[PDB]
Write a protein that holds these residues in place. Structure first.
Motif, PDB file in Angstrom:
ATOM      1  N   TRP A  61       0.807  -1.213   0.000  1.00  0.00           N
ATOM      2  CA  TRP A  61       0.000   0.000   0.000  1.00  0.00           C
ATOM      3  C   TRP A  61       0.842   1.266   0.000  1.00  0.00           C
ATOM      4  CZ3 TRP A  61      -4.570  -0.667  -1.638  1.00  0.00           C
ATOM      5  CH2 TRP A  61      -5.295  -1.821  -1.326  1.00  0.00           C
ATOM      6  N   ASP A  62       2.154   1.154   0.213  1.00  0.00           N
ATOM      7  CA  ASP A  62       3.028   2.317   0.122  1.00  0.00           C
ATOM      8  C   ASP A  62       3.306   2.711  -1.320  1.00  0.00           C
ATOM      9  OD1 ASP A  62       4.960   1.532   3.072  1.00  0.00           O
ATOM     10  OD2 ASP A  62       3.471   3.120   2.768  1.00  0.00           O
ATOM     11  N   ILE A  63       3.376   1.740  -2.220  1.00  0.00           N
ATOM     12  CA  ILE A  63       3.646   2.035  -3.631  1.00  0.00           C
ATOM     13  C   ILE A  63       2.407   2.662  -4.259  1.00  0.00           C
ATOM     14  CG2 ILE A  63       4.263   1.046  -5.839  1.00  0.00           C
ATOM     15  CD1 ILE A  63       5.438  -1.332  -3.949  1.00  0.00           C
ATOM     16  N   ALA A 100     -12.332  -5.451  -5.708  1.00  0.00           N
ATOM     17  CA  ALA A 100     -12.888  -4.117  -5.911  1.00  0.00           C
ATOM     18  C   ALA A 100     -13.337  -3.504  -4.591  1.00  0.00           C
ATOM     19  CB  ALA A 100     -14.053  -4.180  -6.895  1.00  0.00           C
ATOM     20  N   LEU A 101     -13.971  -4.303  -3.731  1.00  0.00           N
ATOM     21  CA  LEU A 101     -14.361  -3.810  -2.415  1.00  0.00           C
ATOM     22  C   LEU A 101     -13.142  -3.420  -1.591  1.00  0.00           C
ATOM     23  CD1 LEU A 101     -17.275  -6.201  -1.410  1.00  0.00           C
ATOM     24  CD2 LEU A 101     -17.409  -3.761  -1.884  1.00  0.00           C
ATOM     25  N   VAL A 102     -12.045  -4.167  -1.727  1.00  0.00           N
ATOM     26  CA  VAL A 102     -10.834  -3.837  -0.985  1.00  0.00           C
ATOM     27  C   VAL A 102     -10.308  -2.475  -1.412  1.00  0.00           C
ATOM     28  CG1 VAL A 102      -8.428  -4.466  -0.650  1.00  0.00           C
ATOM     29  CG2 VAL A 102     -10.198  -6.193  -0.431  1.00  0.00           C
ATOM     30  N   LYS A 103     -10.341  -2.190  -2.713  1.00  0.00           N
ATOM     31  CA  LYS A 103      -9.886  -0.891  -3.192  1.00  0.00           C
ATOM     32  C   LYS A 103     -10.781   0.235  -2.684  1.00  0.00           C
ATOM     33  CE  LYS A 103      -7.327   1.924  -5.515  1.00  0.00           C
ATOM     34  NZ  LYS A 103      -6.053   2.375  -4.904  1.00  0.00           N
ATOM     35  N   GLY A 117     -12.543   0.312   0.080  1.00  0.00           N
ATOM     36  CA  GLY A 117     -12.255   0.512   1.487  1.00  0.00           C
ATOM     37  C   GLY A 117     -10.954   1.248   1.721  1.00  0.00           C
ATOM     38  N   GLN A 118      -9.957   1.008   0.873  1.00  0.00           N
ATOM     39  CA  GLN A 118      -8.717   1.766   0.978  1.00  0.00           C
ATOM     40  C   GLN A 118      -8.945   3.241   0.667  1.00  0.00           C
ATOM     41  OE1 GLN A 118      -6.329   2.769  -1.958  1.00  0.00           O
ATOM     42  NE2 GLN A 118      -5.471   3.991  -0.290  1.00  0.00           N
ATOM     43  N   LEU A 119      -9.712   3.542  -0.383  1.00  0.00           N
ATOM     44  CA  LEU A 119      -9.989   4.935  -0.716  1.00  0.00           C
ATOM     45  C   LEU A 119     -10.821   5.612   0.362  1.00  0.00           C
ATOM     46  CD1 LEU A 119     -10.942   4.163  -4.391  1.00  0.00           C
ATOM     47  CD2 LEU A 119      -8.944   5.515  -3.750  1.00  0.00           C
ATOM     48  N   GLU A 120     -11.850   4.932   0.860  1.00  0.00           N
ATOM     49  CA  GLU A 120     -12.806   5.525   1.784  1.00  0.00           C
ATOM     50  C   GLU A 120     -12.487   5.229   3.241  1.00  0.00           C
ATOM     51  OE1 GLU A 120     -16.518   6.329   0.527  1.00  0.00           O
ATOM     52  OE2 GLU A 120     -15.710   6.532  -1.498  1.00  0.00           O
ATOM     53  N   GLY A 121     -11.386   4.542   3.521  1.00  0.00           N
ATOM     54  CA  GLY A 121     -11.024   4.260   4.899  1.00  0.00           C
ATOM     55  C   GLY A 121     -12.005   3.365   5.622  1.00  0.00           C
ATOM     56  N   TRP A 122     -12.513   2.337   4.950  1.00  0.00           N
ATOM     57  CA  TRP A 122     -13.352   1.359   5.625  1.00  0.00           C
ATOM     58  C   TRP A 122     -12.517   0.539   6.597  1.00  0.00           C
ATOM     59  CZ3 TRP A 122     -16.214  -0.855   0.722  1.00  0.00           C
ATOM     60  CH2 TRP A 122     -17.024   0.156   0.194  1.00  0.00           C
TER      61      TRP A 122
END
Ligand SMILES: CCCCCCCCCCCCCCCCCC(=O)OC[C@H](COP(=O)([O-])OCC(O)COP(=O)([O-])OC[C@@H](COC(=O)CCCCCCCCCCCCCCCCC)OC(=O)CCCCCCCCCCCCCCCCC)OC(=O)CCCCCCCCCCCCCCCCC
Ligand SMILES: CCCCCCCCCCCCCCCCCC(=O)OC[C@H](COP(=O)([O-])OCC(O)COP(=O)([O-])OC[C@@H](COC(=O)CCCCCCCCCCCCCCCCC)OC(=O)CCCCCCCCCCCCCCCCC)OC(=O)CCCCCCCCCCCCCCCCC
Ligand SMILES: CCCCCCCCCCCCCCCCCC(=O)OC[C@H](COP(=O)(O)OCCN)OC(=O)CCCCCCCCCCCCCCCCC
Ligand SMILES: CCCCCCCCCCCCCCCCCC(=O)OC[C@H](COP(=O)(O)OCCN)OC(=O)CCCCCCCCCCCCCCCCC
Ligand SMILES: CCCCCCCCCCCCCCCCCC(=O)OC[C@H](COP(=O)(O)OCCN)OC(=O)CCCCCCCCCCCCCCCCC
Ligand SMILES: CCCCCCCCCCCCCCCCCC(=O)OC[C@H](COP(=O)(O)OCCN)OC(=O)CCCCCCCCCCCCCCCCC
Ligand SMILES: CCCCCCCCCCCCO[C@@H]1O[C@H](CO)[C@@H](O[C@H]2O[C@H](CO)[C@@H](O)[C@H](O)[C@H]2O)[C@H](O)[C@H]1O
Ligand SMILES: CCCCCCCCCCCCO[C@@H]1O[C@H](CO)[C@@H](O[C@H]2O[C@H](CO)[C@@H](O)[C@H](O)[C@H]2O)[C@H](O)[C@H]1O
Ligand SMILES: CCCCCCCCCCCCO[C@@H]1O[C@H](CO)[C@@H](O[C@H]2O[C@H](CO)[C@@H](O)[C@H](O)[C@H]2O)[C@H](O)[C@H]1O
Ligand SMILES: Nc1nc2c(ncn2[C@@H]2O[C@H](COP(=O)(O)OP(=O)(O)OP(=O)(O)O)[C@@H](O)[C@H]2O)c(=O)[nH]1
Ligand SMILES: N=C(N)NC(=N)NCCc1ccc(I)c(Cl)c1
Ligand SMILES: [Mg+2]
Lengths: 320, 140, 98, 95, 83, 347, 174, 63, 111
Positions: free
Chosen positions: B9-11, B122-125, B127-132
């Protein structure tokens, strides 16, 4: 106090009530062997309670008003039909045998409960230990299938292991030609259709399997037709027995408390007589069983638990 | 497990594909090894070699899925010039699902795996964008 | 931490791995269970003695007494298993698979 | 305790052995009695959420007394340096 | 009572070992509460000085606290000497 | 068993639990578990058969291992804090060891394997104690140490138990195994909410105990241990089938029944903490349990299975089992939802 | 040197644990546990635990482990299999033995070591207490306090031992 | 019912519900602050009681 | 500490004996009485009225005290919340309220 742990704790222990006269005696033999008369004489002379052989309506005699119920409430098992049509496609032959084993199991539980609660011995005519001779005879004449025998042994395996064997086994030894002679003389139209081969198979099971087995653990007394008339000699033999075998010697108040807790609960006694094994002879369809059960509830004094039936004169129901 | 997930997630998305494909392949390999360990302990292999074959079979199968997802999802973001897009993960997730069908030699499993794993990625992405939060810190 | 704690902690881990990696004899797994207790007794005693926690001096004894009683129960179960099958092999205790 | 029967009845079932600064036979003190006392008194009644941050100094001192990690590390440093100098003959120890 | 004595004679004849055990165990439970000497056990144990008797800072209002060990104030062990 | 001994052994099981619940010292907590485990083995063994011996031995090994790990956590905690007070632990390694030890005692996945096997191998009354009363002592410790518990570890244990419990029950025809896997799933709900609101853990535990006791009592009244045996109830005690139906739908979490309440309040507490994915995943996964509860209702109450001829002999005798508290327990198991705000008494 | 006696005993402690934990015949496993018990007492003795050390001998070795060997001879093994003849036992024994030696080598070389966690290696004597001139054994005072402070401990412990008798008689009656 | 009764009955319903909604939001805010700061009666996790400490002179002076 | 109803709970008004929740508790007790008759195959409505009465009374008696604790626990929650808000005015500022004439909301046509 209804019997239970509280009654046991407060000193209702079996060893108190049981004497050297507290004996369970069973009389066995072939059909028409005269065991019924001998059993009554033994019970009279020794002051024991006599149990007439458990038949198709034994359970009715212990519940309700004690009178027999219609035949649909025993599954339409018929000993008369068994002689008329032992190979009937309706499975009556094994349905009768399975029902009779359960009736004997219930009676054995009643006999033990009487012995353990009062201390007075009992005399039975055949038992769950000798019931198999009829099943073996049935199978060997081709009246029932092998799967029926497998079902019978399953039920027996998980039921007979809970109970103690008789103190004394009395066998009356009448040969088959004489038995057939006594059957024709008795003049019951259906019984006369019995075959000597069926009778010979009953005797073979008795002498081949039953008596040798019970000898390991019981006191086995054998008499001929003539020797069985002298009831006093039979009773003299019984009173002079040593009682040096069997599991009755291992029993104690603790073990007899568990046994009395079992035999007094008749639903627990009959638990494994209805194991879900879908044998055609004993399986009843849902629509029939539902219909028959509703009819049973409509019988007098049967809708509610005994003592709560206003239609047969029970009172104070609103305080009971 | 927190160190690899920190590297991945750093890259930035759509860049440094080889590094991305290594993190997901190693993640997939770990899951494969975990599955093999329980499988071998609870279902004893007939022999030592059969146990090694099973461990490699599961472990490679899981690293194959992890590699394809990482590579495909990183190329999709690069080719489309859409870094913060869940559709890239959906494409990467379905690609991994097809591999499972191939490795398990089946068409129904591949189709089912493509849809379920494709949606999950897709759900994982998102949640990363929206801070789930999956394991949320107690706050009240 | 002090140097002794390394080996005492290691001994517990060795016996824990021994307990979790069964072989055949149930007795062998019981010994590992009592080995775990032994290492716990030593570590607790060392901590309590070194810190001069006076009233806690009785704690290792209580641990020893209760753990010995637990071991007595375990041994009773082992003999009942052995009476049933003639050995204390854990592979015989698989009826409840079904 | 889940059910604090002891406080409700005023009976002491096991509190007497919970801490080393409680009363002991013949007033025998524990080695870290003064550190435990300071930490307990600092943290009393404010709750563990607050005490974790506000009594950190007392707790760090207490943990140093308990396990003596910093002290042993400092001694390790001085001994290690002394061995170096003696190995180089630059230091002779007094009697 | 008579039934009590008959029971005791029976056990004395058949199980003297158990009768003695119970009698000794009964005396052990009962006699401490009936003994006039049990109170001294408490006093002697308390009078044994295991640790140092830390002196008190004199505030000028402790007439009952001795200033010197040989001063009259303070506990006396004369009861123990005569025991 | 002698009836007086059975009482004293039952009281010792209770006393061991009570000691765990009233203790402020970690040693006394450990003693409570030791005493409790000693007294429960005789009721697992009471029917004397190889299956009951295997269950008692499998149970002993699991609980003894868990108690050793617990004592390790206690001793590590003593080394790093110099005290025994039952509360948050003062060392993360100690917290993991105690959490794992308590998860093993509760039979949480992946330490769950013993629960179905031990429950299957012991009598119904003993299984009733195993799956209800025995949860009290470990849960009461978790109630007190939860501030120091690793959040990821506890939530992983919870999620696994809900999945394993749900999936494991799908393949079962033995009632004791169905209850065992049902127990595993319900433990997961209890621990999932513990980091957020322990009160909701208590609510779920109490309601679970009530419905679990109801089901075991109804199985005991008819001496039913298998699905097919339970399918004969309609032709003997029709009222019992209706009670079983209502209780199973409650354990399924269907409104308007009592078993909806714990799931309802756990979802609320988790959402207040911005936990949305996890409660949603838990609620959907609990549909697995509803499936195999519904399967039992089909074979017990909503259809009439084939009967046997000898069943007619049973029509002539009444139920003589105690069925203690059953009328009260079944009403609480199904009709408590309108009183949900009463959960504040547990605060 | 004798200044490392506690450490040396602890090393022997571990080897005895690797002994029975690799699980040879329970006869030999019992022997390995007995040697570890004696060595464990010695470690406790050197920290001033005279009474505690002797309880391991009296109760753990003279009581519990005697009953273990008695039961092994009667219900488990009557003739021991040759030690380390099994491959897994030999491998497990060698694996643990090598791990201990690598630990011991490094801690002695550097006077510290990090095996997962950080351990000092200067010798356990360094943490000992420097002032002691009381006229009693502190361990004895603490243990004696069981009868004055530990009323509740005595009650629950005594009760559990009575239930131990009752329970074991139930288990074995069969 | 006349429109006035329903109208003003509606207002009484709205006042009760609005007050409950505000209290629900305040409780979430109060709980958030107490849990983060530990300065309230909620989320008060126990610490060792200082009345357990023995303050009498010890066998040795340095403590 | 470990008290069902602490003494401070006596400042609250008692639950009325006609509480709708208490009536429901009584009804649950009545239902248990009927289910007791049913499982034992007695006449459901008439059998053992003495027993049916105690089922209702027991439920109501226990229900009354459980309701009392319920209300007290919610009074304590409000008491704690309001005290904390008073103690920390800086965290609960009195909001500056604008009217809808001054507030700008976007319009989203439905066409
Ligand atoms: C607010 C949340 C929601 C509501 C929560 C409510 C919680 C439940 C409240 C308690 C309800 C308990 C049941 C009420 C009693 C009903 C049964 C009854 O009337 O028995 C009368 C009882 C005997 O009745 P029975 O003919 O044997 O029939 C028993 C029933 O079948 C039933 O027999 P059983 O086997 O089911 O056992 C029932 C009873 C044991 O049976 C009894 O002896 C009755 C005792 C009930 C005590 C109720 C106390 C409630 C107040 C709490 C303080 O158990 C108890 O001891 C109660 C605990 O007569 C008495 O001796 C009265 C008790 C004297 C003391
Ligand atoms: C510091 C930490 C402590 C370090 C300990 C140092 C050593 C001191 C002693 C400690 C106690 C060791 C106890 C060992 C033992 O008794 O187990 C016997 C155990 C079963 O005894 P057995 O009845 O004689 O059967 C022997 C075989 O299992 C054959 O039996 P089979 O009938 O099942 O034959 C088929 C074979 C099939 O084998 C395979 O297929 C495995 C191939 C997997 C490839 C990947 O089955 C197995 O191998 C079962 C294991 C499969 C692997 C499980 C996944 C891990 O045998 C072993 O597994 C030997 C392993 C010993 C290695 C010790 C390594 C210790 C490290 C622990 C982790 C700590 C890391 C930090
Ligand atoms: C605490 C944190 C621990 C994290 C790990 C949690 C996982 C614990 C899993 C415990 C339950 C596993 C039970 C199980 O699933 O059975 C064993 C299973 C074997 O199944 P397998 O051999 O792969 O398939 C054969 C089909 N022909 O083996 C498995 O596949 C289980 C894999 C589970 C991990 C994913
Ligand atoms: C609230 C839930 C209360 C639950 C009460 C349930 C009472 C037990 C079930 C009643 C059925 C009749 C009965 O006697 O129970 C069976 C069992 C006794 O076992 P049994 O096989 O009948 O014979 C014993 C002699 N060996 O009875 C027992 O042994 C008791 C086992 C149940 C005790 C655990 C109850 C759950 C925990 C209650 C705490 C609530 C919080
Ligand atoms: C109030 C607020 C809370 C709201 C939550 C909702 C609570 C509802 C659940 C309450 C708890 C369950 C109590 C149900 C009582 C059942 C008693 C009954 O209706 O009679 C059963 C009936 C009687 O049969 P029998 O014993 O033989 O006597 C008649 C002789 N022919 O036996 C039969 O005839 C069997 C008939 C076949 C079974 C059909 C089942 C469908 C009917 C379901 C009714 C129960 C509802 C279950 C769902 C809840
Ligand atoms: C303010 C009034 C409100 C009333 C509605 C309240 C509904 C909520 C409460 C429902 C909870 C269950 C109530 C308790 C069940 C008691 C009835 C019962 O279980 O037995 C059925 C009984 C059958 O009649 P019987 O010939 O006497 O046979 C008895 C069999 N042993 O039946 C009888 O003949 C007795 C006469 C009354 C039976 C009522 C049956 C209700 C069925 C409920 C179904 C489930 C709810 C939907
Ligand atoms: C069928 C569906 C099955 C269930 C599907 C569940 C979907 C759940 C969504 C995945 C979880 C959310 O995804 C997670 O969000 C947080 C939010 O920053 C990220 O958190 C990350 O923040 C920064 C980057 O912003 C990183 O430096 C840090 O390493 C990491 O903590 C995680 O790296 C990410 O993995
Ligand atoms: C499942 C395994 C079963 C066998 C268990 C074996 C025994 C385990 C012994 C654990 C004792 C060591 O425990 C560990 O010690 C070190 C020493 O400071 C602590 O300290 C370590 O982490 C903290 C982090 O803030 C700091 O102190 C520092 O960074 C580091 O030294 C750890 O916080 C503690 O977790
Ligand atoms: C399941 C079993 C049911 C039986 C329950 C029996 C419970 C018995 C509880 C015993 C403890 C009673 O309560 C406790 O008693 C002892 C004396 O007796 C007191 O203890 C007293 O002697 C010692 C010596 O100093 C110290 O603990 C303390 O200085 C002093 O108070 C405690 O101050 C008191 O709180
Ligand atoms: N199929 C079957 N018939 C049985 C069984 N027990 C009894 N019967 C039948 O019931 C009838 C009466 O049995 P018996 O007691 O032996 O004949 P009895 O003449 O009346 O009595 P005795 O004079 O003593 O011999 C016989 O026709 C038996 O075959 C049984 O278990 N199975
Ligand atoms: N740990 C949690 N999040 N829950 C919790 N118990 N919070 C405390 C807040 C609270 C809620 C309801 C009531 I009634 C009371 Cl008195 C107090
Ligand atoms: Mg006749």
């Amino acid at each position: 106090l209804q019997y239970g742990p509280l009654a046991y704790i407060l000193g209702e222990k079996a060893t108190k009530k049981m004497t050297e006269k507290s004996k369970l005696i069973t009389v066995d033999g072939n059909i028409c062997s005269g065991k019924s008369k001998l059993a009554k004489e033994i019970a009279e002379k020794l002051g024991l309670k006599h149990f007439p052989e458990a038949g198709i309506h034994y359970v009715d005699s212990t519940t309700g008003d004690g009178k027999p119920l219609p035949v649909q409430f025993s599954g339409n098992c018929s000993l008369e039909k068994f002689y008329d049509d032992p190979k009937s496609n309706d499975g009556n032959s094994y349905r009768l045998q399975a029902w009779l084993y359960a009736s004997r199991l219930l009676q054995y539980a009643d006999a033990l409960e009487h012995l353990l609660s009062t201390g007075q011995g009992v005399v039975l005519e055949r038992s769950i230990y000798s019931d198999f001779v009829f099943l073996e005879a049935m199978y060997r004449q081709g009246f029932i299938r092998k799967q029926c025998v497998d079902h019978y042994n399953q039920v027996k395996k998980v039921t007979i292991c809970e109970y103690l064997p008789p103190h004394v086994v009395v066998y009356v030894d009448v040969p088959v030609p004489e038995v057939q002679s006594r059957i024709q003389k008795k003049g019951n139209p259906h019984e006369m259709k019995i075959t000597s081969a069926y009778l010979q198979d009953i005797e073979n099971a008795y002498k081949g399997t039953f008596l040798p087995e019970m000898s390991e653990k019981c006191e086995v007394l054998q008499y001929s037709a003539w020797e069985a008339q002298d009831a006093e000699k039979v009773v003299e033999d019984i009173e002079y027995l040593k009682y040096d075998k069997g599991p009755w010697l291992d029993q104690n108040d603790r073990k007899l408390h568990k046994l009395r807790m079992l035999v007094q609960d008749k639903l627990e006694v009959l638990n494994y007589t209805s194991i879900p094994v879908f044998l055609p002879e004993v399986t009843v369809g849902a629509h029939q069983s539902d219909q028959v059960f509703q009819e049973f509830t409509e019988l007098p004094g049967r809708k509610y638990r005994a003592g709560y039936n206003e239609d047969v004169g029970d009172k104070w129901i609103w305080l009971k | 497990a927190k160190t690899v997930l920190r590297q991945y997630w750093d890259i930035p998305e759509g860049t440094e594909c080889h590094r991305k494909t290594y993190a997901t392949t190693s993640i997939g390999g770990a899951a494969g090894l975990v599955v093999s360990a329980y499988s071998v302990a609870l279902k004893t292999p007939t022999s030592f070699l059969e146990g090694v074959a099973r461990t490699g079979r599961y472990t490679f199968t899981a690293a194959a899925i992890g590699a394809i997802f990482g590579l495909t999802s990183c190329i999709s973001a690069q080719v489309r010039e859409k870094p913060d897009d869940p559709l890239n993960y959906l494409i990467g997730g379905c690609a991994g699902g097809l591999i499972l069908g191939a490795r398990t030699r089946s068409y129904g499993i591949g189709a089912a795996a493509c849809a379920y794993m494709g949606l999950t990625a897709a759900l994982v992405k998102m949640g990363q964008l929206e801070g789930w939060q999956v394991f949320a810190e107690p706050k009240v | 931490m002090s140097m002794v704690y390394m080996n005492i902690m290691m001994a517990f881990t060795v016996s824990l791995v021994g307990l979790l990696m069964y072989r055949s004899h149930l007795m062998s797994s019981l010994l590992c269970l009592e080995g775990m207790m032994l290492s716990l007794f030593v570590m607790a005693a060392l901590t309590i003695l070194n810190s001069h926690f006076t009233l806690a001096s009785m704690m290792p004894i209580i641990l020893l007494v209760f753990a010995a009683c637990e071991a007595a129960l375990g041994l009773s179960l082992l003999v009942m298993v052995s009476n049933t099958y003639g050995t204390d092999y854990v592979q015989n205790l698989n009826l409840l698979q079904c | 305790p889940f059910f604090d029967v002891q406080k409700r009845l005023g009976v002491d079932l096991d509190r007497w052995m919970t801490i080393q600064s409680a009363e002991q036979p013949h007033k025998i003190p524990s080695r870290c009695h003064a550190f435990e006392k300071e930490w307990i008194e600092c943290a009393h009644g404010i709750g563990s959420i607050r005490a974790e941050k506000e009594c950190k100094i007392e707790f760090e001192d207490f943990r140093e007394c308990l396990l003596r990690q910093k002290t042993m590390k400092r001694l390790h440093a001085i001994r290690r340096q002394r061995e170096k100098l003696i190995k180089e003959g630059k230091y002779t120890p007094p009697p | 009572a008579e039934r009590v004595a008959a029971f005791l004679k029976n056990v004395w004849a058949k199980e003297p070992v158990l009768v003695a055990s119970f009698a000794i165990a009964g005396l052990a439970v009962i006699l401490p509460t009936l003994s006039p000497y049990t109170k001294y056990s408490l006093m002697i144990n308390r009078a044994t000085p295991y640790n140092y008797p830390v002196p008190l800072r004199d505030d000028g209002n402790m007439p009952d606290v001795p200033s010197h060990p040989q001063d009259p104030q303070g506990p006396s062990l004369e009861w123990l000497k005569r025991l | 068993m002698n009836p007086i001994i059975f009482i004293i052994i039952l009281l010792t099981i209770m006393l061991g639990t009570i000691i765990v619940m009233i203790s402020s010292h970690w040693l006394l907590v450990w003693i409570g578990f030791e005493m409790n485990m000693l007294a429960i083995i005789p009721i697992m063994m009471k029917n004397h058969n190889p299956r009951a011996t295997e269950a008692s031995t499998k149970y002993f090994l699991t609980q003894s291992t868990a108690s050793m790990l617990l004592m390790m956590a206690v001793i590590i905690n003593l080394m790093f804090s110099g005290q025994w007070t039952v509360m948050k632990l003062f060392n993360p390694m100690a917290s993991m060891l105690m959490t794992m030890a308590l998860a093993m005692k509760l039979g949480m996945a992946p330490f769950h394997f013993w629960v179905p096997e031990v429950t299957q191998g012991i009598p119904l009354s003993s299984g009733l104690i195993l799956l209800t009363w025995q949860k009290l002592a470990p849960m009461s410790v978790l109630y007190q140490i939860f501030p120091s518990i690793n959040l990821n570890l506890i939530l992983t244990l919870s999620v696994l138990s809900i999945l394993i419990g749900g999936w494991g029950g799908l393949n079962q025809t033995q009632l004791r195994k169905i209850m065992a896997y049902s127990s595993i799933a319900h433990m997961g709900w209890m621990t999932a909410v513990l980091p957020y609101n322990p009160t909701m853990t208590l609510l779920n535990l109490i309601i679970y105990i009530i419905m679990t006791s109801t089901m075991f009592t109804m199985f005991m009244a008819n001496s039913t241990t298998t699905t097919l045996s339970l399918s004969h109830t309609w032709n003997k005690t029709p009222i019992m089938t209706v009670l079983i139906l209502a209780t199973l739908l409650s354990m399924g979490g269907l409104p308007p029944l009592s078993g909806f309440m714990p799931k309802w309040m756990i979802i609320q507490e988790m959402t207040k903490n911005n936990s949305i994915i996890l409660p949603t995943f838990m609620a959907i996964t609990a549909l697995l349990n509803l499936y195999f509860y519904m399967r039992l209702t089909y074979s017990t109450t909503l259809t009439m299975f084939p009967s046997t001829n000898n069943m007619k002999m049973k029509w002539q005798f009444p139920l003589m089992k105690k069925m203690t508290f059953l009328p009260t327990m079944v009403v609480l198991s199904t009709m408590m939802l309108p009183l949900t705000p009463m959960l504040s008494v547990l605060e | 040197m004798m200044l490392y006696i506690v450490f040396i005993l602890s090393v022997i402690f571990v080897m005895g644990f690797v002994g029975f934990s690799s699980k040879p015949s329970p006869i030999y496993g019992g022997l390995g546990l007995i040697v570890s018990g004696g060595v464990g007492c010695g470690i406790v003795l050197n920290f001033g635990g005279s009474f505690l050390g002797l309880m391991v001998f009296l109760i753990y070795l003279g009581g519990m482990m005697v009953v273990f060997g008695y039961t092994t001879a009667m219900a488990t093994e009557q003739y021991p299999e040759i030690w380390l003849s099994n491959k897994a036992v030999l491998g497990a024994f060698v694996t643990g033995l090598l791990m201990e030696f690598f630990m011991v080598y490094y801690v002695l070389k550097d006077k510290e070591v990090e095996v997962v966690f950080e351990f000092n290696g200067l010798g356990d004597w360094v943490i000992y207490d420097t002032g002691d001139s009381g006229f009693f054994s502190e361990e004895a005072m603490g243990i004696a306090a069981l009868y004055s402070y530990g009323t509740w401990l005595v009650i629950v412990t005594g009760w559990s031992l009575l239930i131990g008798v009752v329970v074991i008689m139930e288990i074995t009656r069969g | 019912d006349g429109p006035e009764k329903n109208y003003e009955r509606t207002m009484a319903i709205l006042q009760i519900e609005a007050e409950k909604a505000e209290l629900r939001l305040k409780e979430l805010e109060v709980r958030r602050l107490m849990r983060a700061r530990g300065d309230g009666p909620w989320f008060h996790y126990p610490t060792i009681d200082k009345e357990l400490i023995d303050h009498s002179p010890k066998a040795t002076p340095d403590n | 500490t470990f008290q069902f109803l602490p003494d401070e709970a006596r400042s609250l008004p008692p639950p009325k004996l006609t509480d709708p929740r208490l009536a429901f508790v009584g009804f649950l007790g009545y239902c248990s009485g009927l289910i007791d008759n049913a499982i034992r195959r007695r006449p459901v409505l008439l059998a053992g009225l003495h027993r049916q009465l105690l089922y209702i009374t027991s439920f109501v008696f226990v229900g009354y005290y459980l309701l009392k604790r319920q209300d007290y626990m919610y009074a304590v929650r409000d008491h704690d919340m309001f005290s904390y808000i008073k103690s920390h005015p800086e965290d609960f500022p009195e909001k500056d309220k604008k009217t809808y004439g001054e507030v700008f909301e976007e319009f989203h046509p439905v066409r």
